[PDB]
């Protein structure tokens, strides 16, 4: 249920918290063919899950 | 005598303009309670306004609240 969104002028400042976003692959797509890919998370995606 | 009665009879000839002061003073009695009303409806469309509107209207006394949320970063 948690989303980066949620750490920036809460808890965190905005920078900290999209370069903290940035650690991690997130799953996107599908694109012009149809393939599904990976991406650097962005402030608006949700926390990964193992 | 023809005087008399002549008198008697144009004595409300003139009805449409009584009609029109009636307005005058029913409407002067009832306008005021525009100010109540007005004031309402300024006070709820306050927060939807811009806010530099915001803080021109209340001639700056009005500023964004401060929680403690939401600094300035370094
Ligand atoms: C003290 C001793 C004790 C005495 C006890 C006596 C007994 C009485 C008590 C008195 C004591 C105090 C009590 C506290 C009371 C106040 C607290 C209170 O009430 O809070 C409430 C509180 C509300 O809180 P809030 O809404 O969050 O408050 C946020 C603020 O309002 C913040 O909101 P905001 O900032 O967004 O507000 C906006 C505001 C912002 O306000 C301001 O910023 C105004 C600033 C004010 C300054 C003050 C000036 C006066 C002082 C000056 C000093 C003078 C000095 C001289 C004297 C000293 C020296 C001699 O602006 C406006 O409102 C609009 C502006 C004005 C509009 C008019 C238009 C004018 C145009 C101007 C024209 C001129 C040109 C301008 C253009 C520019 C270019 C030229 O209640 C709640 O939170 C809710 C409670 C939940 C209950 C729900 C209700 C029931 C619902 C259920 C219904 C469903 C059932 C069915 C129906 C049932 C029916 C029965
Ligand atoms: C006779 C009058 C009957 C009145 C009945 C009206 C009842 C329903 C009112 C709905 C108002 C919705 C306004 C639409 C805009 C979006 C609101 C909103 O949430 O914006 C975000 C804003 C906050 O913004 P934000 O932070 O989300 O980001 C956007 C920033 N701004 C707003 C600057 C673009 O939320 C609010 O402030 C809540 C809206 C409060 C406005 C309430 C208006 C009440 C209207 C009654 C006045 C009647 C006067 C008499 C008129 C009669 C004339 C004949």
Redesign the interface.
């Known amino acids: 249920q948690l989303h980066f969104r949620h750490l920036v002028?809460?808890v965190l400042?905005?920078?900290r918290v999209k370069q903290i976003a940035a650690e991690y692959d997130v799953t996107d797509g599908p694109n012009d063919q149809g393939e599904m890919y990976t991406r650097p998370g962005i402030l608006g995606d949700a926390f990964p899950s193992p | 005598s023809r005087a008399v009665y002549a008198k008697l009879w144009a004595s409300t000839a003139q009805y449409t303009q009584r009609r029109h002061y009636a307005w005058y003073q029913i409407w002067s009695r009832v306008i005021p309670w525009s100010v109540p009303w007005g004031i309402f409806a300024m006070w709820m469309v306050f927060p939807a306004m811009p806010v530099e509107y915001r803080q021109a209207l209340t001639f700056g006394i009005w500023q964004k609240p401060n929680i403690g949320t939401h600094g300035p970063d370094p």
């Open positions: 002028g809460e400042p905005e920078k």
